[PDB]
Design an enzyme around this catalytic site. Structure first.
Site, short mmCIF file in Angstrom:
data_model
loop_
_atom_site.label_atom_id
_atom_site.label_comp_id
_atom_site.label_asym_id
_atom_site.label_seq_id
_atom_site.Cartn_x
_atom_site.Cartn_y
_atom_site.Cartn_z
N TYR A 1 2.82 2.94 -4.70
CA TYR A 1 3.87 3.59 -5.48
C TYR A 1 3.89 5.11 -5.28
O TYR A 1 4.96 5.69 -5.14
CB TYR A 1 3.68 3.29 -6.97
N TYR B 1 -7.02 0.41 -12.94
CA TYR B 1 -5.73 0.56 -12.25
C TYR B 1 -4.61 -0.39 -12.66
O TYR B 1 -3.44 -0.08 -12.39
CB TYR B 1 -5.93 0.48 -10.73
N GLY C 1 -3.61 3.14 -16.39
CA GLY C 1 -4.61 3.84 -15.62
C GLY C 1 -4.30 3.92 -14.14
O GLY C 1 -3.61 3.07 -13.57
N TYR D 1 15.40 -3.47 -6.77
CA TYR D 1 15.46 -3.94 -5.40
C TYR D 1 16.02 -5.37 -5.33
O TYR D 1 16.37 -5.95 -6.36
CB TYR D 1 14.09 -3.80 -4.72
N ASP E 1 5.17 -4.28 -4.57
CA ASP E 1 5.13 -5.28 -5.63
C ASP E 1 4.81 -6.67 -5.11
O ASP E 1 4.21 -7.49 -5.81
CB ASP E 1 6.46 -5.29 -6.38
N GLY F 1 -2.29 -1.22 -14.75
CA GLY F 1 -1.76 -0.82 -15.99
C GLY F 1 -1.56 0.69 -15.99
O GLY F 1 -1.28 1.32 -14.96
N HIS G 1 -1.83 -0.99 -5.08
CA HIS G 1 -0.47 -0.96 -5.61
C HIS G 1 -0.08 0.43 -6.15
O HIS G 1 1.01 0.94 -5.86
CB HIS G 1 -0.32 -2.02 -6.70
N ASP G 2 -0.99 1.04 -6.92
CA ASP G 2 -0.80 2.38 -7.45
C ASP G 2 -0.59 3.40 -6.32
O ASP G 2 0.33 4.22 -6.36
CB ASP G 2 -1.97 2.80 -8.36
CA LIG Z 1 -1.80 1.95 -12.42
#
Ligand SMILES: [Ca+2]
Lengths: 119, 6
Positions: free
Chosen positions: A51, A27, A31, A67, A93, A29, A47-48
């Site tokens: 988003y 994840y 992926g 932001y 983030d 990156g 985090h993914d």
């Molecule tokens: Ca990711």
């Protein structure tokens, strides 16, 4: 935006090159699938997902949305002048960067084969 | 993170 997230990472984990977090596990990156390989990868999975949720807001593009935030004296603060998109993305983030600081880093998990290991 | 800058 990505540049700002990079700066959050530089600010929370100054011992390591920001690049260390740019390609790790399933994840962190490019992926965004599979079983997270460890604690750091779980920071990136959350985090993914964060988003993906923010992306439901019309006109909200987490990689690109600029932001308003500060990183000073050891503390991240998403500022009051943020709209809903900005506030959501900044918060994603923020807690990711904080998560990274407390996560172990396993050199084995850098640059793994996403096609083979992240289904 | 991500280096998918553009
Ligand atoms: Ca990711």
């Amino acid at each position: 935006n990505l540049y700002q997230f990079k700066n959050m990472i530089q600010c929370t984990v100054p011992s390591r090159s920001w690049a260390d977090f740019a390609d790790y596990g399933c994840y962190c990156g490019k992926g965004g699938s599979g079983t997270p390989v460890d604690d750091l990868d779980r920071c990136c999975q959350t985090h993914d997902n964060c988003y993906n949720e923010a992306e439901n807001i019309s006109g909200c593009r987490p990689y690109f949305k600029t932001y308003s935030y500060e990183c000073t004296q050891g503390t991240l603060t998403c500022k009051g002048d943020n709209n809903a998109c900005a506030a959501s993305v900044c918060d994603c983030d923020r807690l990711a960067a904080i998560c990274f600081a407390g996560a172990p880093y396993n050199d084995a998990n850098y640059n793994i084969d996403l096609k083979a290991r992240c289904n | 993170k991500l280096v998918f800058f553009a």
